[PDB]
Amino acid sequence: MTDTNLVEMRAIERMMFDYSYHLDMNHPEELAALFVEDCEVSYAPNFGATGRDAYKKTLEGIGTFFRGTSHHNSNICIDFVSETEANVRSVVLAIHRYTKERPDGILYGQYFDTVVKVDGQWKFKRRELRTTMTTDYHVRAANPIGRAE
Amino acid sequence: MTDTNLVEMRAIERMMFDYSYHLDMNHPEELAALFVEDCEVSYAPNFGATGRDAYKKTLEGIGTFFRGTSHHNSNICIDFVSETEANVRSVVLAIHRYTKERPDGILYGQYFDTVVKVDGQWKFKRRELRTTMTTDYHVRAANPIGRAE
Amino acid sequence: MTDTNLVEMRAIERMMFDYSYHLDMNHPEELAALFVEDCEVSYAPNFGATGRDAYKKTLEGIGTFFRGTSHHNSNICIDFVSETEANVRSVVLAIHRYTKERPDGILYGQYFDTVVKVDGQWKFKRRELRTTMTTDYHVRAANPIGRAE
Ligand SMILES: [Mg+2]
Ligand SMILES: [Mg+2]
Ligand SMILES: [Mg+2]
Known part of the structure; x- marks a missing residue:
């Protein structure tokens, strides 16, 4: 319902922000705790992770490869399948300061996510x-956004 | 009421994000569907659109002029006139990758909007x-933010 | 309760956005109105303000030192202590255009805040x-984020 949708939108956004925080903090175990076992991640047509x-x-x-990163997540759009499953579209600005001497690397991206609620946690x-x-x-390889020509 | 305000804040933000998405995707008909007939747009004291x-x-x-854009919309402040009319202030970061060879063009901006709800859609x-x-x-011409000197 | 938490999350975010707006507008009195008398601000281990x-x-x-600034605040995470006290973690992108001739200065940061509600205002x-x-x-001095090595 309405109440459920509003509260869970906040919880989903919080999880996404906790993810970006733990990423910028170099906390890989906290990151992995925010994925189900049977997950999929796609960063390029030939690059990602199954499980x-x-x-x-x-x-x-x-x-080791970065001295720091900063992730700024905005434009978060949430469509509930059910009260424990949602599809999310969002925008990311991600800045990377390398350990090697080279300019900061900037990613302008979109995330297309499916999130599920398990034992009280998205x-x-x-x-x-x-x-x-x-x-x-x-990173050279990428999934395109599908911009109309 | 409270409930109405919260739900409609989410809907307004969603519409604004859908706008930025369709803009980055080069979907001009989707963009135009998010404006009333009797609209006004102002980008500079001598530049905009009436209707x-x-x-x-x-x-x-x-x-044609851009190979890509990325719009990041944040700091969204919504004041309801009524349940079908709101005034919105927000911040935008907009990056433009040109088709001509020149550095990416960055806009740091504020939007002052009035949104209306018609037939279920903001x-x-x-x-x-x-x-x-x-x-x-x-773009050289611009509406200033009105920063105090 | 639920209702209280949702409404106050919106109010807290609004205050934070009003702060960034008034900062970009060079409105120092409006900024100071958003702090309690008995406040603390920390920008570096040896730099801030007490009261x-x-x-x-x-x-x-x-x-005088900037011709303009742009603050983009995102990734806002709010934990209520009570209905009139909350702890907030957020991300900031802050761009500074100097009055002296030098490149724009970019801050990628995190804010760790405690906000209180007084006489209807956070x-x-x-x-x-x-x-x-x-x-x-x-600015050279800084509080580190505490990134794991
Ligand atoms: Mg195992
Ligand atoms: Mg016609
Ligand atoms: Mg005094």
């Missing part, structure tokens, strides 16, 4: 990053 | 962009 | 800025 352990592996090196079941564009960035 | 058809014309070339009745500042941008 | 008058002093020169009781990183910026 939580594979996802954990994608987190390796956050602490978690990611699927995340699909679509890359709007990048600057001085370290 | 929806004129607004549609301002969308020409999105696909739409823009007025948008006024105030330009806080810009970098490497393609 | 509202000291805070007011930190606002001196906004109009106000800051404590703000602690943690600096994720900066670019071409004018």
